[PDB]
Amino acid sequence: GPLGSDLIQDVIRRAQENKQRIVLPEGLEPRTLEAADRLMADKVVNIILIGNVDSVKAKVAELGLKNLDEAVIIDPNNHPKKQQYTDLLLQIRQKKGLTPEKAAELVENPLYLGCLIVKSGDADGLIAGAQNTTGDVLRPALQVIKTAPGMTSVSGTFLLFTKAKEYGKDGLLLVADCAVIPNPTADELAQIAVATARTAKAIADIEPRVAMLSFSTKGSAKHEMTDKVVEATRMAQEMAPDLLIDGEMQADAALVERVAALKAPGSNVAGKANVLVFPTLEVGNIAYKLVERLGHAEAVGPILQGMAAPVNDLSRGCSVEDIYRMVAITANQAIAAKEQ
Amino acid sequence: GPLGSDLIQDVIRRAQENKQRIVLPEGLEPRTLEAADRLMADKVVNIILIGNVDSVKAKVAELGLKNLDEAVIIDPNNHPKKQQYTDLLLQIRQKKGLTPEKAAELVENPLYLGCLIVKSGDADGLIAGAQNTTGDVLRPALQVIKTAPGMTSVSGTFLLFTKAKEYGKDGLLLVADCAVIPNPTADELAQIAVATARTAKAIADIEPRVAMLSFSTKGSAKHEMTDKVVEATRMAQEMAPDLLIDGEMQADAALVERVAALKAPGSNVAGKANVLVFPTLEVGNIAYKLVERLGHAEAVGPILQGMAAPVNDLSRGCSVEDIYRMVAITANQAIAAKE
């Protein structure tokens, strides 16, 4: 929306105006059910819960939730599309090797079923990870839904709502990769830059100005590490000639006009960056957390980028609000994909 | 700024209570002379200025400074210890290929002379860089003064005065290495941890809780990069078994008790960190700058650590206050080096 600080409210509203179907494989997980209850009450999405119908209904009753009577519940052991989904899974895993017998096992795994629902067009997005490892969430996602065209990996971005309104869009920047890839290749780093810029435009209403960060600015501190960022910058520009991407540059050159004017003259990014691309996961994971904690920024994420259809992974330590927000964001990813 | 001011007053007081000799090789640089004037008025340190005596006196008179009459001024071209210092430089560097001829050239260089004064024990520390490159300041420092016992490398730390008083010491943490080493070895990273902990005690009166940072916490995300931090943690503990150092851990595990309880139970650091050790310069240089800019934190530094006697390097764009502060910090480092 017009102010970057109001983005979460805008995300919720956008979801409400165009209701999407979101699958929650963790249909008995309490925080997930609490979130689903509020989401359904607020008309944000149409919820699909995975689990034994009697078990799920009993859990809803046990937690005292009142807004989930009209939620779709699908039992992985018994539902109308079970054989169809089994055959689809076999088709996908035919070359790598999957027998009918163990396809029949896997289709009853809620995480696999969830991905097959989305892949089949019977839902618009999936969220899990409140009671599953990231690895266990991502494995069926990458096996069944897969990465989007051109993308060889997925990455995680955060909305960083900072108290420095003079930077980004009223203090908001997107930053990546903060979750997935330990040490991106130049090619992987270029993918991250393009994906994060696309996410920024599509979901956050930001006109991207993408800074490829380094301890060097435009050859000030040459090093093999610096070379990787330089190459990633060139590769990202080739991938997406429409985007404003520049690098390599230090964090102060990215944000501060005075510094940019000296260290990166004429740059279309330096001094007004609103998307920060970190060279490694050590940088990404440490830096966003320190900006959050030491800077009192609000960090919303991780938002997964590069999947062929919207899949997000929650922290196992997530709050109910975290789930509510990430479901709304998942819906916005789906809406964006449909409008483009 | 307001965030830094109380600790900085403590640094100044500690300097005043145990006066050290600080060499200023840039004895004609105006900001340096303004700083030296206030430092001498406040009895923070004993200043040694390097330059032609008549040139320095003329400059002081031109600027109208009134507190520098008793400052020691040493002319590199003409002073009674010139031969002694030349021979010391040769003793240190002759095996590295320094000739007597070239030693006699270098002793006339104020940065080399300054380092030779310190190395001789005729001063306690040195600051420069208002009108010299970092490279030119550090070269004689590393050649002549060299690294402290157990250190074979130096690093740059910042006092990061954050607006999050619930973390570190009323919002203050020391963070390193933010300046020097692109990709520390496990050994170099261990040295950073120990050096930064010692700097934290010496300068900030902090009881160190040192977090060796990673994208992993205690084996949550195993990787070659994670392995390096794990090894650095073990090596740091071996170097200084007295210090409270733990890792590998994520930044949230370092700072947040609730997260520490889940991800690093029983840690002697997690949830209480006041010193953050970054695994690479990409991490260090990006992270402190983003906390400064996006977080409105005040970053005082870089402070160079690991030297046998303190040498610090100012920005060429530094303020008078920057110089005053860094001299006081250098003095506190000198006090620590003498213990």
Residue numbers in the entry:
A (entry chain B): -3 to 336
B (entry chain A): -3 to 335
Sentences from the paper on this structure:
Porphyromonas gingivalis, a black-pigmented Gram-negative rod-type bacterium, is a keystone pathogen linked to the onset and progression of periodontitis. In many bacteria, the enzymes phosphotransacetylase (Pta, EC 2.3.1.8) and acetate kinase (Ack, EC 2.7.2.1) form a key pathway for production of ATP from excess acetyl coenzyme A (acetyl-CoA). Pta produces acetyl phosphate (AcP) from acetyl-CoA, and AcP is subsequently converted to acetate by Ack, with the concomitant production of ATP through substrate-level phosphorylation. In the current study, recombinant Pta (PgPta) and Ack (PgAck) from P. gingivalis ATCC 33277, encoded by pta (PGN_1179) and ack (PGN_1178), respectively, were prepared and enzymatically characterized.
Structural and mutational analyses suggest that Pta is a dimer with two substrate-binding sites in each subunit. Six amino acid residues (Arg89, Arg135, Asp309, Ser311, Arg312, and Asp318) positioned at the cleft and the acetyl-CoA binding site were mutated and recombinant proteins were prepared to investigate their contributions to catalytic activity. The polypeptide region in which Asp309, Ser311, and Arg312 are located forms part of the side of the cleft on the domain I side, with Ser311 and Arg312 positioned at the edge of the cleft, and Asp309 located near the bottom of the cleft. Mutation of these residues resulted in the complete loss of enzyme activity. Finally, Asp318 is located at the edge of the cleft on the opposite side from the observed acetyl-CoA binding site. The D318A mutant displayed only 11% of the specific activity of the WT enzyme.
